[PDB]
Amino acid sequence: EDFYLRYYVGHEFLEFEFRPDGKLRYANMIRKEAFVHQSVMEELKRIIIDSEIMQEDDLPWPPPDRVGRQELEIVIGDEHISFTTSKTGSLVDVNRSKDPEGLRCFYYLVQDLKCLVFSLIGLHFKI
Amino acid sequence: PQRSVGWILFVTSIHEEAQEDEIQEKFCDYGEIKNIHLNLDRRTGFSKGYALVEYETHKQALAAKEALNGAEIMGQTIQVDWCFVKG
Amino acid sequence: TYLQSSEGKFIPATKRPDGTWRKARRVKDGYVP
Numbered sequence: 001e002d003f004y005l006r007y008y009v010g011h012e013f014l015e016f017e018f019r020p021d022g023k024l025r026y027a028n029m030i031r032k033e034a035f036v037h038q039s040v041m042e043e044l045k046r047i048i049i050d051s052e053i054m055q056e057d058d059l060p061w062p063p064p065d066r067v068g069r070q071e072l073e074i075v076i077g078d079e080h081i082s083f084t085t086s087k088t089g090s091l092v093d094v095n096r097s098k099d100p101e102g103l104r105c106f107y108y109l110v111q112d113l114k115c116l117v118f119s120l121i122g123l124h125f126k127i
Numbered sequence: 128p129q130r131s132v133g134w135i136l137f138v139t140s141i142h143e144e145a146q147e148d149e150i151q152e153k154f155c156d157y158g159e160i161k162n163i164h165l166n167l168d169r170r171t172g173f174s175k176g177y178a179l180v181e182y183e184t185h186k187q188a189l190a191a192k193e194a195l196n197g198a199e200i201m202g203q204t205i206q207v208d209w210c211f212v213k214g
Numbered sequence: 215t216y217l218q219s220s221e222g223k224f225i226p227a228t229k230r231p232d233g234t235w236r237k238a239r240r241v242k243d244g245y246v247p
């Protein structure tokens with residue numbers, strides 16, 4: 001079952017990617033690389049599936065703005081998504097869109113992904 | 128496995144209502160814990176389900192992994208693995 | 215919106231533009247960001 005995940009937000013920016021083999025690439029300059037155990041990949045997939053983000057559509061969401069943009073690409077098996085939006089620094093910004101409920105699922109999934117990546121990179125490289 | 132700039136374990140299948148003390152009480156016996164990241168699901172207030180645990184040495188992390196994989200936290204079986212591996 | 219059930223409060227399910235439904239999610243007792 002194929003897998004891929006990449007998240008981008010931002011030339012100031014933050015970017016991280018998980019390849020199928022567990023390779024984690026991080027960039028924010030600060031560029032880190034490390035291979036995570038299969039248990040980490042398993043947990044990542046569980047979080048993604050639980051978020052139901054794969055069933056969302058970004059059409060109603062705000063397009064890349066001037067303050068910045070966000071990109072979320074995910075592939076799980078035959079399913080895949082490629083979202084592009086403007087920055088979403090808080091819930092007040094989410095609740096100001098046409099589809100606030102859908103955008104909040106995106107906001108929270110992104111928050112969960114960042115928390116996991118920050119913990120992995122931060123503790124591994126003592127950043 | 129792959130050591131960090133300490134040695135890090137990745138714990139999964141952690142009960143949603145577990146707090147940091149659940150981790151500390153289970154893992155403190157096998158060595159000095161440098162860091163515990165029991166990440167919260169900010170949308171629900173529950174623990175997301177995983178934790179990173181860093182011991183000072185490899186012997187400690189190995190001992191913890193061998194004894195705690197399969198242990199129970201709040202009645203739920205946890206899995207304990209190395210967090211990083213070599214390419 | 216939080217809808218309290220007999221076991222606590224939860225985030226109610228919502229309908230997506232495509233007609234499908236997002237699942238309801240329980241929230242920890244006494245929690246609010």
Ligand SMILES: [Ca+2]
Pocket residue numbers: 145146148149
């Ligand atoms: Ca406790």
Ligand SMILES: [Ca+2]
Pocket residue numbers: 148149152
């Ligand atoms: Ca306790």
Ligand SMILES: [Ca+2]
Pocket residue numbers: 197198199204
């Ligand atoms: Ca048991």
